[PDB]
Amino acid sequence: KPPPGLKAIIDHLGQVYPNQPNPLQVTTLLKYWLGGQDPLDYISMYNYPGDVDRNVPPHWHYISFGLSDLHGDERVHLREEGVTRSGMGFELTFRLAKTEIELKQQIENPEKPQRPPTWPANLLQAIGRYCFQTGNGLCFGDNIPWRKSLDGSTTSKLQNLLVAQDPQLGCIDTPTGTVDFCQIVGVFDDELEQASRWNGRGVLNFLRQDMQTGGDWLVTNMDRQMSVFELFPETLLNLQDDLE
Amino acid sequence: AAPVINSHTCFVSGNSNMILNHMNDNFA
């Protein structure tokens, strides 16, 4: 019988992606529970073709395994009586917009299926370490003041993260406890500033309103040039301190 | 003379503790 937490997540992903039964995974060699430094055992990578009505562009969808209790035997996560969460109670997801270069390949260019970028696996491992080392889990609406380009590029204006509920995956119960899917969203400095000083959910709601800022499913585009407040200056009206 | 076919070797995006495989390589 398979590891019960891992199996629940795989089963959930099978329902959501019935036509991708065997995705690529980034797999760790020395597992964290054997003394490795990378807390995620696996990161699945899926292609999502998009959805016109919901303003979802084609993108790569990443899902981590290891922040929740994959195994049930305390090899990583101690089980406390009366705790309902599986491990830290969540896994990380990330939605990454295909670049213009990538988009010109898969429709005309020929032989073999295009490989997803693997750099987001480092990003999720690093966020995973941050959560293990501080002991704080992530909640919807949270921000992470990462302060560096998510892809390690010198050019991307996306240096920080907000946390949203994954629109496809949502939250599930498993044999080892509940697992929320916490979708990481790359944001501009001003977006981070306002999520921090005002509110994260309200900033995510702004981002969802247009395709240019992520559409309904909050896809991160590393080449995004303008923040939501630059594109739609009306959103600034919600940010004023009220006196009183 | 100094040539090098020698070629070792970090596996996924700079992380030597990671490899790229298919899900079914990891499970039934």
PDB file of C-alpha atoms in Angstrom:
ATOM      1  CA  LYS A   1       0.000   0.000   0.000  1.00  0.00           C
ATOM      2  CA  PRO A   2       1.442   3.400  -1.149  1.00  0.00           C
ATOM      3  CA  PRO A   3       2.315   6.308   1.123  1.00  0.00           C
ATOM      4  CA  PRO A   4      -1.175   7.588   1.985  1.00  0.00           C
ATOM      5  CA  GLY A   5      -0.558  11.342   1.884  1.00  0.00           C
ATOM      6  CA  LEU A   6       1.350  11.112  -1.404  1.00  0.00           C
ATOM      7  CA  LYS A   7      -1.384   8.826  -2.882  1.00  0.00           C
ATOM      8  CA  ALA A   8      -4.233  11.280  -1.934  1.00  0.00           C
ATOM      9  CA  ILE A   9      -2.474  14.178  -3.632  1.00  0.00           C
ATOM     10  CA  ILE A  10      -1.630  12.083  -6.760  1.00  0.00           C
ATOM     11  CA  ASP A  11      -5.242  10.922  -6.916  1.00  0.00           C
ATOM     12  CA  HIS A  12      -6.495  14.528  -6.651  1.00  0.00           C
ATOM     13  CA  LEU A  13      -4.101  15.601  -9.423  1.00  0.00           C
ATOM     14  CA  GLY A  14      -5.322  12.646 -11.541  1.00  0.00           C
ATOM     15  CA  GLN A  15      -8.884  13.996 -11.380  1.00  0.00           C
ATOM     16  CA  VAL A  16      -7.804  17.493 -12.272  1.00  0.00           C
ATOM     17  CA  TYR A  17      -5.424  16.366 -15.056  1.00  0.00           C
ATOM     18  CA  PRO A  18      -6.954  13.123 -16.415  1.00  0.00           C
ATOM     19  CA  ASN A  19      -5.079  13.586 -19.726  1.00  0.00           C
ATOM     20  CA  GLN A  20      -1.676  13.934 -18.062  1.00  0.00           C
ATOM     21  CA  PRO A  21      -1.419  10.674 -16.085  1.00  0.00           C
ATOM     22  CA  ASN A  22       2.414  10.663 -16.064  1.00  0.00           C
ATOM     23  CA  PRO A  23       3.827  14.193 -15.650  1.00  0.00           C
ATOM     24  CA  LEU A  24       7.495  15.010 -15.346  1.00  0.00           C
ATOM     25  CA  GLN A  25       8.664  15.432 -11.756  1.00  0.00           C
ATOM     26  CA  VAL A  26      11.699  17.092 -10.272  1.00  0.00           C
ATOM     27  CA  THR A  27      12.747  14.408  -7.781  1.00  0.00           C
ATOM     28  CA  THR A  28      15.195  14.798  -4.897  1.00  0.00           C
ATOM     29  CA  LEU A  29      18.067  12.300  -4.661  1.00  0.00           C
ATOM     30  CA  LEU A  30      18.882  12.395  -0.930  1.00  0.00           C
ATOM     31  CA  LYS A  31      15.406  12.789   0.666  1.00  0.00           C
ATOM     32  CA  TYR A  32      14.949  15.292   3.471  1.00  0.00           C
ATOM     33  CA  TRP A  33      14.006  12.461   5.841  1.00  0.00           C
ATOM     34  CA  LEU A  34      17.405  10.866   5.147  1.00  0.00           C
ATOM     35  CA  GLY A  35      19.244  14.074   5.987  1.00  0.00           C
ATOM     36  CA  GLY A  36      19.016  16.008   2.687  1.00  0.00           C
ATOM     37  CA  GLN A  37      18.533  19.801   2.746  1.00  0.00           C
ATOM     38  CA  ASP A  38      15.639  19.920   0.213  1.00  0.00           C
ATOM     39  CA  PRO A  39      12.334  19.463   2.095  1.00  0.00           C
ATOM     40  CA  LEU A  40      10.282  18.614  -1.025  1.00  0.00           C
ATOM     41  CA  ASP A  41      10.567  15.003  -2.152  1.00  0.00           C
ATOM     42  CA  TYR A  42       8.934  15.736  -5.559  1.00  0.00           C
ATOM     43  CA  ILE A  43       7.584  18.633  -7.662  1.00  0.00           C
ATOM     44  CA  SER A  44       5.135  17.690 -10.396  1.00  0.00           C
ATOM     45  CA  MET A  45       4.998  19.862 -13.530  1.00  0.00           C
ATOM     46  CA  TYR A  46       1.906  20.083 -15.732  1.00  0.00           C
ATOM     47  CA  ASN A  47       0.977  21.933 -18.902  1.00  0.00           C
ATOM     48  CA  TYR A  48      -2.250  23.883 -18.689  1.00  0.00           C
ATOM     49  CA  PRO A  49      -3.575  24.885 -22.158  1.00  0.00           C
ATOM     50  CA  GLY A  50      -5.647  27.780 -20.766  1.00  0.00           C
ATOM     51  CA  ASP A  51      -9.307  28.785 -20.575  1.00  0.00           C
ATOM     52  CA  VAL A  52     -10.662  31.674 -22.672  1.00  0.00           C
ATOM     53  CA  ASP A  53     -13.716  32.550 -20.543  1.00  0.00           C
ATOM     54  CA  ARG A  54     -11.749  32.616 -17.272  1.00  0.00           C
ATOM     55  CA  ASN A  55      -8.849  34.611 -18.724  1.00  0.00           C
ATOM     56  CA  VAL A  56      -6.408  31.776 -18.078  1.00  0.00           C
ATOM     57  CA  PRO A  57      -3.414  31.890 -20.442  1.00  0.00           C
ATOM     58  CA  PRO A  58      -1.382  28.776 -21.304  1.00  0.00           C
ATOM     59  CA  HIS A  59       1.056  28.077 -18.510  1.00  0.00           C
ATOM     60  CA  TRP A  60       3.147  25.634 -16.544  1.00  0.00           C
ATOM     61  CA  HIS A  61       1.631  24.403 -13.219  1.00  0.00           C
ATOM     62  CA  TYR A  62       3.993  23.234 -10.457  1.00  0.00           C
ATOM     63  CA  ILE A  63       2.861  21.208  -7.355  1.00  0.00           C
ATOM     64  CA  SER A  64       5.129  20.314  -4.377  1.00  0.00           C
ATOM     65  CA  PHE A  65       5.136  17.167  -2.241  1.00  0.00           C
ATOM     66  CA  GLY A  66       6.700  17.289   1.204  1.00  0.00           C
ATOM     67  CA  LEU A  67       5.237  20.200   3.251  1.00  0.00           C
ATOM     68  CA  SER A  68       2.235  17.980   4.003  1.00  0.00           C
ATOM     69  CA  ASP A  69       2.547  14.543   5.633  1.00  0.00           C
ATOM     70  CA  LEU A  70       3.195  12.241   2.641  1.00  0.00           C
ATOM     71  CA  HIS A  71       3.973   9.153   4.714  1.00  0.00           C
ATOM     72  CA  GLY A  72       2.111   9.104   8.008  1.00  0.00           C
ATOM     73  CA  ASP A  73       5.045   7.604   9.969  1.00  0.00           C
ATOM     74  CA  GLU A  74       6.703  10.746  11.427  1.00  0.00           C
ATOM     75  CA  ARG A  75       9.796  10.482   9.226  1.00  0.00           C
ATOM     76  CA  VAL A  76       9.441  14.263   8.698  1.00  0.00           C
ATOM     77  CA  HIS A  77       6.255  15.422  10.435  1.00  0.00           C
ATOM     78  CA  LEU A  78       5.504  14.692  14.053  1.00  0.00           C
ATOM     79  CA  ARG A  79       1.885  13.715  14.628  1.00  0.00           C
ATOM     80  CA  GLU A  80       0.151  15.497  17.478  1.00  0.00           C
ATOM     81  CA  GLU A  81      -3.096  14.255  18.979  1.00  0.00           C
ATOM     82  CA  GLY A  82      -5.958  16.554  18.021  1.00  0.00           C
ATOM     83  CA  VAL A  83      -4.176  18.204  15.076  1.00  0.00           C
ATOM     84  CA  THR A  84      -6.276  18.043  11.883  1.00  0.00           C
ATOM     85  CA  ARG A  85      -3.570  19.280   9.419  1.00  0.00           C
ATOM     86  CA  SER A  86      -1.356  16.973   7.330  1.00  0.00           C
ATOM     87  CA  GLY A  87       2.226  18.013   8.275  1.00  0.00           C
ATOM     88  CA  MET A  88       2.364  21.779   7.811  1.00  0.00           C
ATOM     89  CA  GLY A  89      -1.160  21.480   6.338  1.00  0.00           C
ATOM     90  CA  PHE A  90      -0.407  22.701   2.836  1.00  0.00           C
ATOM     91  CA  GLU A  91       1.609  22.197  -0.359  1.00  0.00           C
ATOM     92  CA  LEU A  92       2.955  24.870  -2.654  1.00  0.00           C
ATOM     93  CA  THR A  93       1.735  25.496  -6.198  1.00  0.00           C
ATOM     94  CA  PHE A  94       2.927  27.956  -8.859  1.00  0.00           C
ATOM     95  CA  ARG A  95       1.537  28.993 -12.268  1.00  0.00           C
ATOM     96  CA  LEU A  96       4.086  30.225 -14.752  1.00  0.00           C
ATOM     97  CA  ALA A  97       3.138  31.986 -18.028  1.00  0.00           C
ATOM     98  CA  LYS A  98       4.717  30.568 -21.157  1.00  0.00           C
ATOM     99  CA  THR A  99       7.025  33.072 -22.773  1.00  0.00           C
ATOM    100  CA  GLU A 100       6.566  34.390 -26.348  1.00  0.00           C
ATOM    101  CA  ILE A 101       9.499  32.177 -27.380  1.00  0.00           C
ATOM    102  CA  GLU A 102       7.841  29.082 -25.819  1.00  0.00           C
ATOM    103  CA  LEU A 103       4.476  29.916 -27.421  1.00  0.00           C
ATOM    104  CA  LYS A 104       5.877  29.960 -30.961  1.00  0.00           C
ATOM    105  CA  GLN A 105       7.272  26.404 -30.578  1.00  0.00           C
ATOM    106  CA  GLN A 106       4.344  24.099 -29.487  1.00  0.00           C
ATOM    107  CA  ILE A 107       1.916  24.921 -32.328  1.00  0.00           C
ATOM    108  CA  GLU A 108       4.180  24.885 -35.437  1.00  0.00           C
ATOM    109  CA  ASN A 109       7.684  23.665 -34.329  1.00  0.00           C
ATOM    110  CA  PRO A 110       7.749  19.871 -34.529  1.00  0.00           C
ATOM    111  CA  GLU A 111       9.291  16.783 -32.932  1.00  0.00           C
ATOM    112  CA  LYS A 112       9.039  16.374 -29.178  1.00  0.00           C
ATOM    113  CA  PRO A 113       6.877  17.871 -26.408  1.00  0.00           C
ATOM    114  CA  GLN A 114       8.358  21.157 -25.008  1.00  0.00           C
ATOM    115  CA  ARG A 115       9.897  20.699 -21.500  1.00  0.00           C
ATOM    116  CA  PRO A 116       8.617  22.966 -18.663  1.00  0.00           C
ATOM    117  CA  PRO A 117      11.241  25.246 -17.073  1.00  0.00           C
ATOM    118  CA  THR A 118      12.643  23.614 -13.947  1.00  0.00           C
ATOM    119  CA  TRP A 119      13.822  26.760 -12.179  1.00  0.00           C
ATOM    120  CA  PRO A 120      10.522  26.995 -10.217  1.00  0.00           C
ATOM    121  CA  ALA A 121      11.518  23.771  -8.413  1.00  0.00           C
ATOM    122  CA  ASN A 122      14.423  25.670  -6.716  1.00  0.00           C
ATOM    123  CA  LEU A 123      12.007  28.423  -5.820  1.00  0.00           C
ATOM    124  CA  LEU A 124       9.581  25.972  -4.162  1.00  0.00           C
ATOM    125  CA  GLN A 125      12.426  24.138  -2.354  1.00  0.00           C
ATOM    126  CA  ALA A 126      13.667  27.477  -1.000  1.00  0.00           C
ATOM    127  CA  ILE A 127      10.162  28.520   0.128  1.00  0.00           C
ATOM    128  CA  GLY A 128       9.805  25.042   1.638  1.00  0.00           C
ATOM    129  CA  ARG A 129      13.050  25.549   3.625  1.00  0.00           C
ATOM    130  CA  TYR A 130      11.877  28.952   4.786  1.00  0.00           C
ATOM    131  CA  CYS A 131       8.645  27.394   6.165  1.00  0.00           C
ATOM    132  CA  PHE A 132      10.493  24.475   7.878  1.00  0.00           C
ATOM    133  CA  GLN A 133      13.122  26.729   9.396  1.00  0.00           C
ATOM    134  CA  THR A 134      10.766  29.370  10.761  1.00  0.00           C
ATOM    135  CA  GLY A 135       7.844  27.016  11.557  1.00  0.00           C
ATOM    136  CA  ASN A 136       5.271  29.422  10.039  1.00  0.00           C
ATOM    137  CA  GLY A 137       2.873  27.802   7.541  1.00  0.00           C
ATOM    138  CA  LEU A 138       1.354  29.917   4.760  1.00  0.00           C
ATOM    139  CA  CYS A 139      -2.254  31.142   4.602  1.00  0.00           C
ATOM    140  CA  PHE A 140      -4.276  32.664   1.741  1.00  0.00           C
ATOM    141  CA  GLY A 141      -3.611  36.386   1.620  1.00  0.00           C
ATOM    142  CA  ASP A 142      -0.085  36.114   3.132  1.00  0.00           C
ATOM    143  CA  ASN A 143       2.901  37.806   1.552  1.00  0.00           C
ATOM    144  CA  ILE A 144       6.498  36.653   1.434  1.00  0.00           C
ATOM    145  CA  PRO A 145       9.040  39.510   1.206  1.00  0.00           C
ATOM    146  CA  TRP A 146      11.447  37.374  -0.847  1.00  0.00           C
ATOM    147  CA  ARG A 147      13.353  40.407  -2.119  1.00  0.00           C
ATOM    148  CA  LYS A 148      14.892  38.737  -5.194  1.00  0.00           C
ATOM    149  CA  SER A 149      13.813  37.707  -8.668  1.00  0.00           C
ATOM    150  CA  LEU A 150      11.970  34.409  -8.503  1.00  0.00           C
ATOM    151  CA  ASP A 151      13.949  33.035 -11.443  1.00  0.00           C
ATOM    152  CA  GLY A 152      17.306  34.513 -10.399  1.00  0.00           C
ATOM    153  CA  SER A 153      17.268  36.824 -13.460  1.00  0.00           C
ATOM    154  CA  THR A 154      18.592  40.410 -13.261  1.00  0.00           C
ATOM    155  CA  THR A 155      15.650  41.792 -15.291  1.00  0.00           C
ATOM    156  CA  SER A 156      12.376  40.447 -13.840  1.00  0.00           C
ATOM    157  CA  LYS A 157      10.412  42.958 -11.739  1.00  0.00           C
ATOM    158  CA  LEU A 158       8.829  39.995  -9.865  1.00  0.00           C
ATOM    159  CA  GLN A 159      10.876  39.793  -6.582  1.00  0.00           C
ATOM    160  CA  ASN A 160       8.242  38.978  -3.973  1.00  0.00           C
ATOM    161  CA  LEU A 161       5.328  36.651  -3.456  1.00  0.00           C
ATOM    162  CA  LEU A 162       1.703  36.638  -2.381  1.00  0.00           C
ATOM    163  CA  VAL A 163      -0.169  33.492  -1.373  1.00  0.00           C
ATOM    164  CA  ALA A 164      -3.523  32.570  -2.936  1.00  0.00           C
ATOM    165  CA  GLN A 165      -5.714  29.496  -2.836  1.00  0.00           C
ATOM    166  CA  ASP A 166      -5.003  27.350  -5.915  1.00  0.00           C
ATOM    167  CA  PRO A 167      -8.193  27.828  -8.034  1.00  0.00           C
ATOM    168  CA  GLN A 168      -8.101  24.247  -9.454  1.00  0.00           C
ATOM    169  CA  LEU A 169      -6.758  22.296  -6.517  1.00  0.00           C
ATOM    170  CA  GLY A 170      -8.429  24.075  -3.602  1.00  0.00           C
ATOM    171  CA  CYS A 171      -8.144  22.253  -0.282  1.00  0.00           C
ATOM    172  CA  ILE A 172      -8.537  18.507   0.318  1.00  0.00           C
ATOM    173  CA  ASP A 173      -8.786  15.981   3.132  1.00  0.00           C
ATOM    174  CA  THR A 174      -6.375  13.038   3.054  1.00  0.00           C
ATOM    175  CA  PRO A 175      -5.715   9.953   5.157  1.00  0.00           C
ATOM    176  CA  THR A 176      -2.940  11.952   6.889  1.00  0.00           C
ATOM    177  CA  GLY A 177      -4.922  15.178   7.370  1.00  0.00           C
ATOM    178  CA  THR A 178      -6.012  18.288   5.519  1.00  0.00           C
ATOM    179  CA  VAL A 179      -3.864  19.788   2.713  1.00  0.00           C
ATOM    180  CA  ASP A 180      -4.533  23.335   1.418  1.00  0.00           C
ATOM    181  CA  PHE A 181      -2.931  24.085  -1.983  1.00  0.00           C
ATOM    182  CA  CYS A 182      -1.185  27.430  -1.459  1.00  0.00           C
ATOM    183  CA  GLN A 183      -0.485  29.037  -4.808  1.00  0.00           C
ATOM    184  CA  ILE A 184       2.482  31.346  -4.856  1.00  0.00           C
ATOM    185  CA  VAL A 185       2.032  34.510  -7.027  1.00  0.00           C
ATOM    186  CA  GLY A 186       4.964  36.706  -8.089  1.00  0.00           C
ATOM    187  CA  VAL A 187       4.350  40.425  -7.491  1.00  0.00           C
ATOM    188  CA  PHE A 188       5.931  43.899  -7.901  1.00  0.00           C
ATOM    189  CA  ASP A 189       7.431  45.839  -5.039  1.00  0.00           C
ATOM    190  CA  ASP A 190       4.389  48.151  -4.840  1.00  0.00           C
ATOM    191  CA  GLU A 191       1.988  45.166  -4.899  1.00  0.00           C
ATOM    192  CA  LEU A 192       3.937  43.629  -2.004  1.00  0.00           C
ATOM    193  CA  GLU A 193       3.961  46.964  -0.182  1.00  0.00           C
ATOM    194  CA  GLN A 194       0.163  47.269  -0.387  1.00  0.00           C
ATOM    195  CA  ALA A 195      -0.545  43.629   0.491  1.00  0.00           C
ATOM    196  CA  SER A 196       1.590  44.243   3.595  1.00  0.00           C
ATOM    197  CA  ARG A 197       0.241  47.647   4.631  1.00  0.00           C
ATOM    198  CA  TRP A 198      -3.356  47.166   3.450  1.00  0.00           C
ATOM    199  CA  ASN A 199      -4.375  43.605   2.561  1.00  0.00           C
ATOM    200  CA  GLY A 200      -3.091  40.646   0.564  1.00  0.00           C
ATOM    201  CA  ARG A 201      -6.470  39.286  -0.502  1.00  0.00           C
ATOM    202  CA  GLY A 202      -7.527  42.743  -1.749  1.00  0.00           C
ATOM    203  CA  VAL A 203      -4.330  42.982  -3.869  1.00  0.00           C
ATOM    204  CA  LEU A 204      -4.885  39.417  -5.241  1.00  0.00           C
ATOM    205  CA  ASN A 205      -8.438  40.443  -6.114  1.00  0.00           C
ATOM    206  CA  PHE A 206      -7.063  43.398  -8.107  1.00  0.00           C
ATOM    207  CA  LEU A 207      -4.626  41.097  -9.980  1.00  0.00           C
ATOM    208  CA  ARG A 208      -7.402  38.656 -10.938  1.00  0.00           C
ATOM    209  CA  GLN A 209      -9.352  41.353 -12.798  1.00  0.00           C
ATOM    210  CA  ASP A 210      -7.282  41.459 -15.971  1.00  0.00           C
ATOM    211  CA  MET A 211      -5.293  38.983 -18.048  1.00  0.00           C
ATOM    212  CA  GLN A 212      -2.313  41.388 -18.048  1.00  0.00           C
ATOM    213  CA  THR A 213      -1.939  40.928 -14.261  1.00  0.00           C
ATOM    214  CA  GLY A 214      -2.560  37.148 -14.092  1.00  0.00           C
ATOM    215  CA  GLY A 215      -6.247  36.628 -14.976  1.00  0.00           C
ATOM    216  CA  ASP A 216      -8.700  34.588 -12.876  1.00  0.00           C
ATOM    217  CA  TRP A 217      -6.099  31.996 -11.862  1.00  0.00           C
ATOM    218  CA  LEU A 218      -3.302  34.395 -10.923  1.00  0.00           C
ATOM    219  CA  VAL A 219      -0.713  33.158 -13.393  1.00  0.00           C
ATOM    220  CA  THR A 220       2.729  34.691 -12.836  1.00  0.00           C
ATOM    221  CA  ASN A 221       4.337  36.292 -15.930  1.00  0.00           C
ATOM    222  CA  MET A 222       8.063  36.962 -15.205  1.00  0.00           C
ATOM    223  CA  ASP A 223       8.188  39.467 -18.085  1.00  0.00           C
ATOM    224  CA  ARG A 224       5.351  41.618 -16.689  1.00  0.00           C
ATOM    225  CA  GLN A 225       6.283  45.267 -17.133  1.00  0.00           C
ATOM    226  CA  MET A 226       3.785  47.237 -15.042  1.00  0.00           C
ATOM    227  CA  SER A 227       2.108  46.710 -11.663  1.00  0.00           C
ATOM    228  CA  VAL A 228      -1.619  46.600 -11.200  1.00  0.00           C
ATOM    229  CA  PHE A 229      -1.500  50.078  -9.660  1.00  0.00           C
ATOM    230  CA  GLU A 230       0.320  51.399 -12.781  1.00  0.00           C
ATOM    231  CA  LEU A 231      -2.112  49.658 -15.169  1.00  0.00           C
ATOM    232  CA  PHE A 232      -5.267  50.508 -13.231  1.00  0.00           C
ATOM    233  CA  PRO A 233      -4.555  53.591 -11.080  1.00  0.00           C
ATOM    234  CA  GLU A 234      -8.139  53.474  -9.772  1.00  0.00           C
ATOM    235  CA  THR A 235      -7.024  50.640  -7.459  1.00  0.00           C
ATOM    236  CA  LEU A 236      -4.916  53.196  -5.512  1.00  0.00           C
ATOM    237  CA  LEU A 237      -8.098  54.661  -3.986  1.00  0.00           C
ATOM    238  CA  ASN A 238      -8.413  51.648  -1.656  1.00  0.00           C
ATOM    239  CA  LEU A 239      -4.983  52.347  -0.117  1.00  0.00           C
ATOM    240  CA  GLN A 240      -5.576  55.673   1.674  1.00  0.00           C
ATOM    241  CA  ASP A 241      -5.272  55.789   5.482  1.00  0.00           C
ATOM    242  CA  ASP A 242      -8.484  57.169   6.887  1.00  0.00           C
ATOM    243  CA  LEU A 243      -8.437  59.708   9.662  1.00  0.00           C
ATOM    244  CA  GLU A 244     -10.557  59.861  11.959  1.00  0.00           C
TER     245      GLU A 244
ATOM    246  CA  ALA B   1      47.375  20.255 -23.078  1.00  0.00           C
ATOM    247  CA  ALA B   2      44.268  20.442 -20.920  1.00  0.00           C
ATOM    248  CA  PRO B   3      41.161  19.098 -22.715  1.00  0.00           C
ATOM    249  CA  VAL B   4      38.106  17.907 -20.806  1.00  0.00           C
ATOM    250  CA  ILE B   5      35.320  15.561 -21.700  1.00  0.00           C
ATOM    251  CA  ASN B   6      35.212  15.302 -17.896  1.00  0.00           C
ATOM    252  CA  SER B   7      31.795  16.378 -17.038  1.00  0.00           C
ATOM    253  CA  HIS B   8      30.525  16.272 -13.493  1.00  0.00           C
ATOM    254  CA  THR B   9      27.703  17.437 -13.004  1.00  0.00           C
ATOM    255  CA  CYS B  10      24.709  19.117 -11.204  1.00  0.00           C
ATOM    256  CA  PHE B  11      21.382  17.922 -12.184  1.00  0.00           C
ATOM    257  CA  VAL B  12      18.453  20.378 -12.137  1.00  0.00           C
ATOM    258  CA  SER B  13      18.706  24.161 -12.332  1.00  0.00           C
ATOM    259  CA  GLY B  14      21.907  24.324 -10.233  1.00  0.00           C
ATOM    260  CA  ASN B  15      20.811  21.828  -7.592  1.00  0.00           C
ATOM    261  CA  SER B  16      22.955  18.705  -7.560  1.00  0.00           C
ATOM    262  CA  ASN B  17      20.461  16.943  -5.241  1.00  0.00           C
ATOM    263  CA  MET B  18      17.699  16.884  -7.899  1.00  0.00           C
ATOM    264  CA  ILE B  19      16.936  14.857 -11.026  1.00  0.00           C
ATOM    265  CA  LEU B  20      14.281  15.079 -13.738  1.00  0.00           C
ATOM    266  CA  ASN B  21      12.132  11.997 -14.159  1.00  0.00           C
ATOM    267  CA  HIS B  22       8.546  10.866 -14.830  1.00  0.00           C
ATOM    268  CA  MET B  23       6.078  10.313 -12.046  1.00  0.00           C
ATOM    269  CA  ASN B  24       5.841   6.589 -12.871  1.00  0.00           C
ATOM    270  CA  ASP B  25       9.645   6.274 -12.294  1.00  0.00           C
ATOM    271  CA  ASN B  26       8.950   7.230  -8.704  1.00  0.00           C
ATOM    272  CA  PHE B  27       5.764   5.079  -8.208  1.00  0.00           C
ATOM    273  CA  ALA B  28       3.652   2.189  -9.501  1.00  0.00           C
TER     274      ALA B  28
END
